[PDB]
Structures are given as C-alpha cells and as structure tokens.
C-alpha cells in the first residue's frame, strides 16, 4: 500500500495501489493507462 505508480505495461486487476498523477488503472484490462 503506497502512492506509487504503474507504467503502460504493469497490470493492476486486484492491486489496491494507485497509478501516477494523471494516469488511470483498468479493472478488466488489468493494466495502467494514461488519459
């Protein structure tokens, strides 16, 4: 649990972590993505 991030490649299905400022994580896509 932290305020880290996730580049365009790292999954995040169950991950409770949050991407960087301006980015968004997809549940079904299970992978961070920019706006």
UniProtKB/Swiss-Prot annotation:
Keywords: Calcium channel impairing toxin, Disulfide bond, Ion channel impairing toxin, Knottin, Neurotoxin, Secreted, Toxin, Voltage-gated calcium channel impairing toxin. Disulfide bonds join 5-20, 12-25, 19-32. PROSITE patterns: ASSASSIN_BUG_TOXIN. It holds the Pfam family Toxin_30. It comes from the Eukaryota. SUPFAM superfamilies: omega toxin-like. GO terms for cellular component: extracellular region. The keyword Ribosomal protein does not apply. It is found in: Secreted. GO terms for molecular function: calcium channel inhibitor activity; toxin activity. Belongs to the venom Ptu1-like knottin family. The presence of a 'disulfide through disulfide knot' structurally defines this protein as a knottin. Binds reversibly and blocks P/Q-type voltage-gated calcium channels (Cav). This is Toxin Ado1.
